[PDB]
Design a protein around this ligand. Structure first.
Ligand SMILES: OC[C@H]1O[C@H](O)[C@@H](O)[C@@H](O)[C@@H]1O
Ligand SMILES: OC[C@H]1O[C@H](O)[C@@H](O)[C@@H](O)[C@@H]1O
Lengths: 480, 480
């Protein structure tokens, strides 16, 4: 027991407190940023520091009765790449064949040069392998339609076109920025004899999450649970929603009028809320967050909301806290390997600490810290490390509720029919598996302007779109 | 169209309102009735008018790692009888084969005499039919153990013995009352060559629901979701919970000390909360409820809470309201068959009205009323019937939350570790399929003394396991 270490920890934990008044302020500011982000910016989209609010050119929420021939789907995340074939049977049913593979660490390192051709050649070959394994009998001329789920910010110009704005989540491929990722992918498919495979749709992982949940939600569930948000809380964080065409002022007025005359009323918006308040006008900030953004992040000055929320960064926050406590001569790092190893403490490490119990002398915390960075600890040190972890995760979960509450308020989403609630489709390892993260998001929602009664009308449902149904639904609509 | 009918309906709807203060009163009173009911009744158990609080002789919550050879299970409800075989694989997994069949209307007509042998012979033959279909090769050669789920109040004397206290729901076989239902069932199994099938456990459907959730709940979910209540909202309503052995004063002190010395701390209590406040000291009561209890129910003076909540009675409430409005010359029943047909309006009929919409001129309500009792309606009449239905169902759901809040408060269930929440295993057609019932129960929980913060820690989870797994777990434990 070191009373000076205990007070230092309690003081740092206080730096992560998010009050009811703060949530209200951030919710209000988020809506302002939404409206600003819906206006056209005559600057560079890569220079823009506001809330991107990217039109996805998706205008229809699936009913569940969509059906068609087998579609192809490719899904590039922050960790895995998947190729799938999806047969939409209507009636909320589908057949899926998929192959999942980790993204090689080769694409995340700077010691050797990585090019766009490396990435998209790798993706085209995986596609070729999938088609050889699961659809060998299909003619080599078959007119495959493919939907491409690309979980990165894209300057979407149509359903099938858009240029990469900037990488995130540790990806470092310099020459992809400013390039149309559908063309890059299509060219590599062409080069290996798969020119008959046409990438006809491009969706963000938020967009796919919303569409897939709209299609799969049964008639009974859909009756009293209306999916209004598809969002992600994993390596990164983001969410989408349906905005009135009239409010999407950055959209060409002729395109708006054309869509309106076709009977459309809304278009899905990829908010890219990981980049909420990149200027830090209001986001809770500690010295540890600044250090992560400026020194250890791949995109300094951008995606600052994500750096306080998503799983890529929560462990790194703890590392910088322990390093600061060592400089203060309060914590003995012993023979650990924390120093000079950014991101060696993972959110997976924290997940073993969050609900560890003192009845077992916090043995899971000890093992996790030894396994991660060879950090020996005493019981008393683990008690304080647990406090730090819980403050980090609570702030992350409280902030995670802000974009959702803001969207629900701006769109008046809680105004529905009798008994009908709003469903927020959630995917990602943090919201799904980090113990207590969902419970704290719900607490924060109850504290937000929607109040406890609004939170009861909100269903944070784990809804995974890892099978490519979201991309498949977009490809089904598009023309070959 | 008729302002006098509209004001009469609004006035009737106001009679079904349950206020926050009322919920608080009923929640407090329920706890008092729990403590009274845990004492010896000092009278006949069949004469007892208090909260039964029946000890089930189940003292251990499954861990999920139980495993063994295939067990048999039989489940007699108020509508169906099902036989199944359950293979417990450990690791929260199991294989189940089951056959469901309606209870013949022969057992529902008093026009001819029905005996216990009729019922249990029918059950034994269905069991034989199940074994012939799914286990033909070893029907007569296996020493089968069977768990018996009997969804009726039983004066349980051990895990495998208990006498029927009284029938509920649409059942009445006089010679079963006071008889050990395990012996009645076992005797009929013996008579058809199934003496090798041993009924070794007897559980209420509430008890089985809790056990099944304890076994099926994954390690991760179980870590932050402790199942504390198994409850039913179907034809009837009821729930069970784990009570400290020291508080079960009606239990023989020698048995309590024996169990305690064996390391046991709790026993599951079948509350039979359908019989909460049979004297109507506080329960909301209308003339329609009194008419149902005194004239149309099989058990007048008992199960009065159930008669305001469960699916057997909600439709019958609407029938008595429409009959009252006709006597007043305010509602035209036309050529309907409502009069002199108790229970012809079902909760299934009401489920089609609850979220029917005026955008479709309430056509589903029109069809449901014609199909149920040949009641033609105008749009205005359907609008008012919908108001009545919604007032009936809201009262049912608000009352349904009272026993749950009371149990959680009495047992200090919300006092747990960090992030740990309580799970309430729910089964039955009403909570599962009646639109909005679960949402209204959650509102009522937020209004109860546990408050909105308590409701967020409560998860009303629909039991996708059933009472067969619960009975199978008890059979696995018992000796052949
Ligand atoms: O994957 C979640 C989220 O992570 C980052 O914020 C970006 O790459 C987004 O495009 C993506 O939606
Ligand atoms: O089936 C739910 C419930 O219905 C009635 O209340 C009784 O028969 C109970 O024994 C039973 O648990």
């Amino acid at each position: 027991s070191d009373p000076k270490l205990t007070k230092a920890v309690d003081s740092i934990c206080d730096q992560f407190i998010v009050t009811k008044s703060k949530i209200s302020q951030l919710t209000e500011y988020f809506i302002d940023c939404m409206e600003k982000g819906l206006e056209p910016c005559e600057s560079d989209i890569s220079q823009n520091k506001g809330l991107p609010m990217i039109p996805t050119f998706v205008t229809d929420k699936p009913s569940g009765q969509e059906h068609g021939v087998t579609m192809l789907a490719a899904d590039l995340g922050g960790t895995n790449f998947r190729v799938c074939s999806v047969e939409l049977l209507g009636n909320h049913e589908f057949k899926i064949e998929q192959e999942k593979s980790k993204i090689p660490t080769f694409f995340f390192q700077d010691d050797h040069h990585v090019t766009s051709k490396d990435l998209f050649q790798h993706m085209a070959l995986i596609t070729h392998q999938f088609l050889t394994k699961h659809h060998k009998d299909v003619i080599q001329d078959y007119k495959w339609k493919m939907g491409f789920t690309f979980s990165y910010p894209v300057d979407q110009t149509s359903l099938s076109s858009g240029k990469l704005i900037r990488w995130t989540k540790g990806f470092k491929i310099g020459d992809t920025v400013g390039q149309d990722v559908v063309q890059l992918f299509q060219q590599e498919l062409n080069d290996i004899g798969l020119s008959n495979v046409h990438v006809v749709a491009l969706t963000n992982d938020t967009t796919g999450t919303l569409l897939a949940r709209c299609y799969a939600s049964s008639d009974a569930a859909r009756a009293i649970n209306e999916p209004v948000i598809g969002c992600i809380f994993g390596t990164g964080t983001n969410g989408c929603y349906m905005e009135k065409l009239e409010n999407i002022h950055k959209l060409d007025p002729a395109s708006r009028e054309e869509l309106l005359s076709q009977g459309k009323t809304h278009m899905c918006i990829n908010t890219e809320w990981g980049s909420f308040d990149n200027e830090l006008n209001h986001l809770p900030t500690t010295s540890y967050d600044i250090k992560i953004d400026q020194q250890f992040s791949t995109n300094p000055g951008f995606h600052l909301f994500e750096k306080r929320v998503s799983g890529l960064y929560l462990g790194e926050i703890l590392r910088n806290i322990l390093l600061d406590l060592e400089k203060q001569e309060l914590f003995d790092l012993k023979e650990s390997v924390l120093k000079n190893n950014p991101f060696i403490l993972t959110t997976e490490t924290l997940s073993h600490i969050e609900i560890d119990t003192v009845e077992n002398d916090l043995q899971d915390t000890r093992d996790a810290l030894l396994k991660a960075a060879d950090l020996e600890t005493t019981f008393e040190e683990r008690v304080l490390i647990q406090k730090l972890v819980r403050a980090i995760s609570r702030r992350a979960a409280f902030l995670a509720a802000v974009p959702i509450a803001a969207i629900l308020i701006k769109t008046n989403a809680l105004n529905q029919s009798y008994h009908c609630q709003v469903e927020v489709g959630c995917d990602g390892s943090v919201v799904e598996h980090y113990p207590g993260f969902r419970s704290m998001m719900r607490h924060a929602l109850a504290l937000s302007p929607i109040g406890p009664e609004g939170e009861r009308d909100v269903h944070l449902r784990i809804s995974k779109d890892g099978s490519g149904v979201g991309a498949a639904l977009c490809a089904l609509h598009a023309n070959y």
